[PDB]
Amino acid sequence: GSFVEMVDNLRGKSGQGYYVEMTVGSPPQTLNILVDTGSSNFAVGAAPHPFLHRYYQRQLSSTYRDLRKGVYVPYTQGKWEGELGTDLVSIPHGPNVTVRANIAAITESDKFFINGSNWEGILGLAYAEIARPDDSLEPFFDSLVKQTHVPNLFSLQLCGAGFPLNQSEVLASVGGSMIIGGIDHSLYTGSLWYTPIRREWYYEVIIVRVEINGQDLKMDCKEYNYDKSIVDSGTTNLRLPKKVFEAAVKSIKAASSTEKFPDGFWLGEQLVCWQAGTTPWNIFPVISLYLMGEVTNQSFRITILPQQYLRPVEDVATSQDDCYKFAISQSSTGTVMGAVIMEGFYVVFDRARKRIGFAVSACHVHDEFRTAAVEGPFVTLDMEDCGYNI
Numbered sequence: 610g611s612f613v614e615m616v617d618n619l620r621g622k623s624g625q626g627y628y629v630e631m632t633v634g635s636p637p638q639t640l641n642i643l644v645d646t647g648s649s650n651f652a653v654g655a656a657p658h659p660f661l662h663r664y665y666q667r668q669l670s671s672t673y674r675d676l677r678k679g680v681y682v683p684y685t686q687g688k689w690e691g692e693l694g695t696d697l698v699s700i701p702h703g704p705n706v707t708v709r710a711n712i713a714a715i716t717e718s719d720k721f722f723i724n725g726s727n728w729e730g731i732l733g734l735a736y737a738e739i740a741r742p743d744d745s746l747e748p749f750f751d752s753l754v755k756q757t758h759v760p761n762l763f764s765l766q767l768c769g770a771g772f773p774l775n776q777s778e779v780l781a782s783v784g785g786s787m788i789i790g791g792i793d794h795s796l797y798t799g800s801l802w803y804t805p806i807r808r809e810w811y812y813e814v815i816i817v818r819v820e821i822n823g824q825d826l827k828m829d830c831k832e833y834n835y836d837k838s839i840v841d842s843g844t845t846n847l848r849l850p851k852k853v854f855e856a857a858v859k860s861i862k863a864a865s866s867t868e869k870f871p872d873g874f875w876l877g878e879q880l881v882c883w884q885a886g887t888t889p890w891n892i893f894p895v896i897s898l899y900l901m902g903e904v905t906n907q908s909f910r911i912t913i914l915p916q917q918y919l920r921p922v923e924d925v926a927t928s929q930d931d932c933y934k935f936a937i938s939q940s941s942t943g944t945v946m947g948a949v950i951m952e953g954f955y956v957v958f959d960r961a962r963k964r965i966g967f968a969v970s971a972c973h974v975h976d977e978f979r980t981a982a983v984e985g986p987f988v989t990l991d992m993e994d995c996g997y998n999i
C-alpha cells in the first residue's frame with residue numbers, strides 16, 4: 610500500500626451511498642461528498658434543507674466565480690436544480706493539490722438528499738458526455754488531471770460491513786477507500802483483471818456470460834448488455850435488464866429452493882430475517898459475471914456471494930435477528946453494477962488506458978467456505994456481438 614494518505618477515506622453504506630470529505634471555497638468549507646461513478650456533475654447543497662446540517666455558502670468564498678448559468682437535473686425519483694459557478698476544491702484525505710473546478714450549487718431538490726446519509730453533495734466521476742447541461746461543463750476529475758500531475762486514474766474499495774450499522778456506528782466506521790491517481794495493493798488479494806471501457810460516457814463494459822452457481826444462464830449475451838452495462842457506485846443494487854432479471858431470479862430461486870421466500874422478497878421490497886447468526890448463506894448460489902478481456906477472444910469472471918447481493922438491514926423490530934433485503938433488481942436502462950457488487954471487489958478505473966480492473970477486495974464479506982473471486986482467462990468468441998447498438 611503506497612497511498613496510505615487515501616486509504617480508509619470513505620464512509621457510508623450501499624443503501625445510502627459512500628462519501629468522501631472535500632473542501633470548497635476560500636477559506637475552505639468542509640462538506641461530505643457522495644462518490645458516484647454513474648454521473649458527471651460535481652454538485653453540492655448550497656441552500657438550507659431539512660436533511661443538511663451544512664451547505665456551501667458562496668458569499669463566504671473569496672474565490673467563488675459565478676457562471677451565470679442554471680442547471681436542471683431530473684432523475685426517476687430525484688430532482689435537483691442549481692446555479693453553476695467555479696471555486697477552488699480540495700480533498701483532505703487525497704492528493705495534496707487544490708484545483709479550480711465547476712460546482713453546481715444546489716438551490717432546489719426533490720428526493721435527492723437522504724436523511725441521515727451524512728453527505729451534502731455528489732461527485733460525478735464519469736465522463737463529460739453525460740454531464741449536465743452538456744459536455745462543455747468539465748467534470749471534476751478532468752479538471753484535476755488537467756491542472757495537476759495526478760495520473761488519470763482512480764480506484765475504489767467500497768466496504769460493506771456485513772451487518773446493519775446504526776446512525777452512530779456508520780459515522781465512526783470506515784466505509785472504504787478512494788485512491789486518487791493510483792492503485793493501492795493492500796486493498797486487494799489475488800490478481801487484477803481488466804475489462805475494456807467500451808465507450809467513454811458512463812463507465813460502460815461488456816458482459817459476455819452469466820452463471821448462477823456455475824450454471825450458464827444461457828441467454829443471448831446481447832441481452833446482458835441491453836441497452837448498456839455500467840459500473841455505478843451511485844446505485845445500491847445489482848440491476849439487470851428485465852429479461853435477464855427474470856431468468857436470474859428463476860435460477861436463484863431454484864438454487865435456494867430448500868427455503869421458500871415471499872414474492873415481496875424477490876421484488877426487493879421486503880426483508881427476510883433469521884435467528885441471530887443462522888443466515889443460511891450456503892443455500893444461496895454464487896453469481897459469476899464474465900467480462901470481455903483485453904486480449905482478443907479472452908474473458909475473465911468476477912464471482913460474488915450472497916453476502917454481497919443480500920443487503921443487511923435493521924429489523925423493523927430492532928431485534929437480534931439478522932435481516933436482509935434482496936439487492937438485485939430489474940432495469941429498463943441496462944445492467945448496473947451497483948455498490949453491493951462493488952463491495953466484493955477493488956475496482957480500478959484506469960481512464961488513461963480506457964479500462965476497468967477488478968480484484969477480490971480485502972474487505973469483502975464472506976464465510977469460511979466461500980470467497981468472492983476474480984478469475985481468468987477464459988476462451989470466449991464473438992464477444993463484440995454482446996454489445997448493444999441502438
Ligand SMILES: CC1(C)NC(=N)N(Cc2cccc(Cl)c2)C1=O
Pocket residue numbers: 626643645646647648684687721841842843844
Ligand atoms: C444513472 C444513475 C441511475 N446512476 C446514478 N448514480 N445516477 C445519479 C443519481 C441519481 C439519483 C440519486 C443518486 Cl444518489 C445518484 C443516475 O441517475
